[PDB]
Amino acid sequence: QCTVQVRLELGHRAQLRKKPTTEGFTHDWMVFVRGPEQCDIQHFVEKVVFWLHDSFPKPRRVCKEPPYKVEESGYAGFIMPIEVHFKNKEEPRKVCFTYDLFLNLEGKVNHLRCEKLTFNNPTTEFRYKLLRAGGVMV
Ligand SMILES: Cc1ccc(C(=O)Nc2ccc3nc(CN4CCCCC4)[nH]c3c2)cc1I
């Protein structure tokens, strides 16, 4: 009976371009998954999959190593599913967030969403990956 908590930070920045691109993109944005300061989520994260709006080319964007992010331009916000896959042999194998990639049509957005994962009775192997990433026993 051991519990290990880890923290993920999901976020995005978005800025209204001074002048739109020749292709009518009004906004640059960047979305990411990371750990807090001094933690290393690559120890227990296999890959992060960002599911972009179906209008984007290759909207299944995968990062297998850090940084777990996508940098894009576009013209609108949307709801972006983000799957974080674990280096876990048992359940849960992954967690899915629905991320609100919203834009400020009149300027800049800099948003952070903090997600605390609780793993009950991880395998010895996966427990090792969580604590090495900076996870805490509860
Ligand atoms: C409700 C909605 C929200 C966002 C988009 C959008 O911005 N789509 C989009 C579609 C294609 C794109 N292509 C780029 C520019 N490239 C993409 C490939 C890598 C280099 C940058 N940005 C793109 C943005 C479309 C809709 I309707």
UniProtKB/Swiss-Prot annotation:
Signal peptide range in chain numbering: none
TM annotation in the entry: none
Site features described as Acylated histone binding, chain residue numbers: 100
Region of interest called Acylated histone binding, as start-end residue ranges on this chain: 53-55, 75-77
Location of this chain's protein in the cell: Nucleus
Location of the YEATS domain: 1-133
Function of the molecule: Chromatin reader component of the super elongation complex (SEC), a complex required to increase the catalytic rate of RNA polymerase II transcription by suppressing transient pausing by the polymerase at multiple sites along the DNA. Specifically recognizes and binds acetylated and crotonylated histones, with a preference for histones that are crotonylated. Has a slightly higher affinity for binding histone H3 crotonylated at 'Lys-27' (H3K27cr) than 'Lys-20' (H3K9cr20).
Disease implication from the record: A chromosomal aberration involving MLLT1 is associated with acute leukemias. Translocation t(11;19)(q23;p13.3) with KMT2A/MLL1. The result is a rogue activator protein.
Protein name: Protein ENL
